[PDB]
Amino acid sequence: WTATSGSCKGRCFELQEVGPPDCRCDNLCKSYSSCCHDFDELCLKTARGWECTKDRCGEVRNEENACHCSEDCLSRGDCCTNYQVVCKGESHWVDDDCEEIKVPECPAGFVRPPLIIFSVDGFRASYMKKGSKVMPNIEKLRSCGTHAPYMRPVYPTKTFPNLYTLATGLYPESHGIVGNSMYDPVFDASFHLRGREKFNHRWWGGQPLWITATKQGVRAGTFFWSVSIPHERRILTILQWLSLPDNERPSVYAFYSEQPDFSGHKYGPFGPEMTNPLREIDKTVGQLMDGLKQLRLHRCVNVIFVGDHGMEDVTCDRTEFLSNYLTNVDDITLVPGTLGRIRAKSINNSKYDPKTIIAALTCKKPDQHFKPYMKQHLPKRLHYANNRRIEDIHLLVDRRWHVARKPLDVYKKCFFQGDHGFDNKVNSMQTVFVGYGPTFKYRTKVPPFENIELYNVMCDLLGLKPAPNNGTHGSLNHLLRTNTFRPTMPDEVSRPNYPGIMYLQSEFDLGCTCDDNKLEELNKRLHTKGSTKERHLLYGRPAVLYRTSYDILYHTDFESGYSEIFLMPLWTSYTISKQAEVSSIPEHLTNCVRPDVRVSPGFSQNCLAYKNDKQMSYGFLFPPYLSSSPEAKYDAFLVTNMVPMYPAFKRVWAYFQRVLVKKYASERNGVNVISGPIFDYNYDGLRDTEDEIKQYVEGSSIPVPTHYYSIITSCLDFTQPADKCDGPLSVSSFILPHRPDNDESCNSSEDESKWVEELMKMHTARVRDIEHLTGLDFYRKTSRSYSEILTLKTYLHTYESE
Numbered sequence: 001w002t003a004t005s006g007s008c009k010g011r012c013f014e015l016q017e018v019g020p021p022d023c024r025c026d027n028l029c030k031s032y033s034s035c036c037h038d039f040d041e042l043c044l045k046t047a048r049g050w051e052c053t054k055d056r057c058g059e060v061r062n063e064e065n066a067c068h069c070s071e072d073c074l075s076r077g078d079c080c081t082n083y084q085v086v087c088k089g090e091s092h093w094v095d096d097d098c099e100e101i102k103v104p105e106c107p108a109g110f111v112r113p114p115l116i117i118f119s120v121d122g123f124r125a126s127y128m129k130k131g132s133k134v135m136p137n138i139e140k141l142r143s144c145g146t147h148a149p150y151m152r153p154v155y156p157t158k159t160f161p162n163l164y165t166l167a168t169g170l171y172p173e174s175h176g177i178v179g180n181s182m183y184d185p186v187f188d189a190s191f192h193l194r195g196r197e198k199f200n201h202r203w204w205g206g207q208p209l210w211i212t213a214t215k216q217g218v219r220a221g222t223f224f225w226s227v228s229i230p231h232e233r234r235i236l237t238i239l240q241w242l243s244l245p246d247n248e249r250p251s252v253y254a255f256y257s258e259q260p261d262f263s264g265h266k267y268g269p270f271g272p273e274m275t276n277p278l279r280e281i282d283k284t285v286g287q288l289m290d291g292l293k294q295l296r297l298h299r300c301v302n303v304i305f306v307g308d309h310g311m312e313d314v315t316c317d318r319t320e321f322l323s324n325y326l327t328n329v330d331d332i333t334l335v336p337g338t339l340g341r342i343r344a345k346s347i348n349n350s351k352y353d354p355k356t357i358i359a360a361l362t363c364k365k366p367d368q369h370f371k372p373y374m375k376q377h378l379p380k381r382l383h384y385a386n387n388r389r390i391e392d393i394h395l396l397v398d399r400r401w402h403v404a405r406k407p408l409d410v411y412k413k414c415f416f417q418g419d420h421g422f423d424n425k426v427n428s429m430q431t432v433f434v435g436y437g438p439t440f441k442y443r444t445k446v447p448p449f450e451n452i453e454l455y456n457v458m459c460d461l462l463g464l465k466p467a468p469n470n471g472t473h474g475s476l477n478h479l480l481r482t483n484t485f486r487p488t489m490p491d492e493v494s495r496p497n498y499p500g501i502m503y504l505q506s507e508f509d510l511g512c513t514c515d516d517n518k519l520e521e522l523n524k525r526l527h528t529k530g531s532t533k534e535r536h537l538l539y540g541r542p543a544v545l546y547r548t549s550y551d552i553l554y555h556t557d558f559e560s561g562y563s564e565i566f567l568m569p570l571w572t573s574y575t576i577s578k579q580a581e582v583s584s585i586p587e588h589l590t591n592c593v594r595p596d597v598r599v600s601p602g603f604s605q606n607c608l609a610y611k612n613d614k615q616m617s618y619g620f621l622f623p624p625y626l627s628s629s630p631e632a633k634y635d636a637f638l639v640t641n642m643v644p645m646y647p648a649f650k651r652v653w654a655y656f657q658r659v660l661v662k663k664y665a666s667e668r669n670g671v672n673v674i675s676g677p678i679f680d681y682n683y684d685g686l687r688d689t690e691d692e693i694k695q696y697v698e699g700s701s702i703p704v705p706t707h708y709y710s711i712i713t714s715c716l717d718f719t720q721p722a723d724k725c726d727g728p729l730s731v732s733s734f735i736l737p738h739r740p741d742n743d744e745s746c747n748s749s750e751d752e753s754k755w756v757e758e759l760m761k762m763h764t765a766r767v768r769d770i771e772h773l774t775g776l777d778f779y780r781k782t783s784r785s786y787s788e789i790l791t792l793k794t795y796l797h798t799y800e801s802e
């Protein structure tokens with residue numbers, strides 16, 4: 001109950017919100033239906049519209065007007081945004097040449113430049129180019145400030161997951177808003193865009209920017225705006241707050257636009273009806289900038305223009321229906337549309353089986369426009385599994401499509417021509433970033449980056465210490481003129497051992513067999529001491545950032561850090577020049593595994609366990625195919641280079657090692673490769689400890705990886721060989737799931753040249769993703785600045801065209 005009979009006089013858009021049943025005047029009261037009786041009259045004035053005109057100049061103050069054109073308005077902070085233009089012969093901000101803002105030019109009493117975040121729902125990245133003629137204010141911000149060609153949203157590319165990622169720096173799985181619609185089985189409650197439950201604080205995890213600011217003594221304007229408050233009024237409220245006294249005035253402000261998303265749903269991303277909403281957004285930007293210039297704040301404030309996600313063409317006819325696949329369709333609940341999430345309709349049905357649901361939805365129709373997954377098999381780059389609100393069964397829907405349960409759902413609920421929510425690597429889902437102000441750089445283009453990184457930068461802009469988040473703090477230092485954050489490299493926790501020859505052949509009883517001069521003996525000794533290490537370990541050895549027991553092992557062709565705990569390398573490092581040759585495994589060596597005389601029998605794998613384990617075979621981390629000489633090839637068959645692999649996965653691995661590495665070496669002028677295992681049995685994105693491992697090679701203590709990674713580095717200037725690079729680096733990486741079948745790839749019964757590369761592309765990764773998953777830290781010794789290396793570690797190779 002609200003006693004809606006208090007008053008909003010002098011209280012309009014109160015920054016601090018009051019407790020029921022005393023009535024509310026905040027920009028969220030409308031949404032609770034708790035506004036005082038006089039809110040509309042006092043706070044939502046509209047008389048005479050939104051602009052001064054010639055005859056209104058120097059008028060008698062009429063407090064009923066929406067904005068003012070009287071003399072006292074500037075001191076009062078409530079002029080129409082075009083007042084000085086109309087009544088003082090000033091120019092519009094958009095008509096002024098741009099001029100570098102070297103230092104904040106702020107009124108007395110400002111302690112720090114204010115930050116204004118202007119976010120736009122559904123503003124697709126290509127609108128910056130394709131709408132440029134109808135957005136002159138936005139184009140000036142873009143060309144004069146710092147801009148990326150696009151910004152990558154998080155998955156799913158829905159509104160609330162992305163806006164809440166902007167505010168917190170967290171993946172949806174950590175902040176808890178995992179879709180626009182959700183069921184939490186612990187609360188036994190649902191979350192919907194329409195309605196009540198979404199306001200409850202228990203949905204919203206992490207610490208958003210406005211809370212981070214308040215806790216550290218920085219005042220914040222409110223971030224939520226009720227849909228019914230018009231845009232002009234939102235701008236005027238912000239401008240008013242900026243005229244408050246020093247001790248009351250916020251330092252951070254947010255504006256939100258429902259456009260162009262709302263129109264894009266009705267008309268498609270490039271419908272001819274889309275020109276008008278883009279014009280209207282630009283006009284709003286113009287009003288903010290004219291208003292700032294009037295207050296002498298246009299060279300004082302940092303402005304961020306940022307989207308949540310793009311928009312794709314999607315129509316009713318492009319719907320797959322689960323009833324064309326499932327007999328049992330009424331025993332399931334589907335979360336539908338541009339992604340799919342499936343659970344049992346009733347927890348009292350013990351006959352429900354996720355396994356047979358998956359099997360019934362896998363590769364059934366020749367052009368099937370969705371692919372089912374257990375959530376823990378989704379590409380790791382999506383970070384979409386570690387939340388009880390995310391259902392075990394997930395459908396990744398092809399761009400331009402929808403999934404629904406039954407046809408009745410689509411026609412009893414064609415309306416729409418646009419939608420979003422797809423995989424966050426998809427071009428049409430990309431969005432925008434522009435930063436403008438004294439703390440951003442002048443006329444600077446930066447490469448594409450992910451929206452998880454912005455929270456850190458907004459903290460930097462405000463002098464705040466960020467709450468723990470998924471950004472990599474310092475990786476966006478290159479956007480900023482000043483306020484950079486100068487991180488230090490994490491300290492190595494475990495130092496390696498460097499074992500020599502300590503064991504005789506006959507001490508090993510592993511069930512392994514292998515059919516196997518003074519000049520060339522000093523030679524082999526030195527290779528084992530680390531003579532070619534500078535060639536194969538280009539960027540230093542990775543640091544181990546947790547407590548463990550491991551050894552560095554040197555070889556002619558490769559170097560590895562071998563784990564005595566997991567009985568296999570944590571990492572294997574080798575360089576393949578443009579010139580290198582592929583050989584085959586000789587016949588006499590096909591099943592050869594050799595004891596490593598540097599490593600105890602007790603810290604070794606064994607061949608018998610693989611013979612006994614009918615499901616599990618093995619592969620090698622440094623590929624035998626790429627050995628430098630017949631004699632160096634023996635090193636590749638050491639038991640310390642062996643790892644467990646399902647026969648289905650060996651098909652993948654073998655093609656990557658036999659064909660693709662040489663291909664990248666020829667295309668890139670040499671590559672450096674680091675490969676290794678990953679164990680993530682609890683799908684949290686973080687390295688497992690030994691007590692978390694759920695599977696072992698039968699009869700042994702050999703743990704089974706959930707994934708295999710590789711990091712492939714070369715010279716960004718590809719006229720320099722990878723091993724002789726003077727400047728910036730170029731990287732691509734992957735995290736391949738270690739699966740006992742190839743069900744994920746519908747064409748896998750064909751030749752590896754038709755499906756393996758496509759699989760690897762799907763499972764593209766950031767080096768940073770691999771660091772979380774292994775507890776390692778790469779690129780420790782380069783000649784590049786650390787911030788530049790952090791940017792490189794957050795890079796994602798997406799394999800989309802331009």
Ligand SMILES: *[C@@H]1O[C@H](CO)[C@@H](O[C@@H]2O[C@H](CO)[C@@H](O[C@@H]3O[C@H](CO[C@H]4O[C@H](CO)[C@@H](O)[C@H](O[C@H]5O[C@H](CO)[C@@H](O)[C@H](O)[C@@H]5O[C@H]5O[C@H](CO)[C@@H](O)[C@H](O)[C@@H]5O)[C@@H]4O)[C@@H](O)[C@H](O[C@H]4O[C@H](CO)[C@@H](O)[C@H](O)[C@@H]4O[C@H]4O[C@H](CO)[C@@H](O)[C@H](O)[C@@H]4O)[C@@H]3O)[C@H](O)[C@H]2NC(C)=O)[C@H](O)[C@H]1NC(C)=O
Nearest residue numbers: 173174175176204205206386387388468469470684685772
């Ligand atoms: C992205 O960045 C984020 C942020 O840095 C990373 O997430 C963090 O990871 C840490 C490790 O997983 C984790 O640390 C744990 O914190 C526990 C205390 O948790 C509360 O406090 C924080 C801080 O105020 C708060 O934010 C948490 O909020 C979560 O929970 C509520 C819902 O319950 C949500 O509203 C909120 O969104 C958030 O949910 C997310 O996180 C949890 C995990 O905490 C997930 O389960 C959810 O699905 C969701 O994703 C909490 O309210 C603390 O209890 C933990 O300590 C246990 O484990 C350690 C190991 O060191 C052990 O020493 C301790 O004894 C303890 O074990 C005991 O409990 C066990 C389990 O009950 C039991 O088995 C044992 O027997 C022991 O007795 C742990 O320190 C931190 O909480 C999150 N933070 C956030 C905000 O998510 C994330 O890793 C990054 N991602 C990547 C890929 O890098």
Ligand SMILES: CC[C@@H](C)O/C(=C\c1ccc(Cl)cc1Cl)c1cccnc1
Nearest residue numbers: 117119163166167223224225254255256
């Ligand atoms: C769910 C989060 C909510 C706060 O997101 C909104 C805006 C937003 C989020 C983050 C940032 Cl950095 C800036 C802005 Cl403007 C919003 C949503 C719906 C109505 N009004 C405002």
Ligand SMILES: [Ca+2]
Nearest residue numbers: 680686687688
């Ligand atoms: Ca884990």
Ligand SMILES: [Cl-]
Nearest residue numbers: 158179180181
């Ligand atoms: Cl959703």
Ligand SMILES: [K+]
Nearest residue numbers: 610613616617
């Ligand atoms: K076997």
Ligand code: NA
Nearest residue numbers: 742743745748
């Ligand atoms: Na298949």
Ligand SMILES: [Zn+2]
Nearest residue numbers: 122159261265
């Ligand atoms: Zn939308």
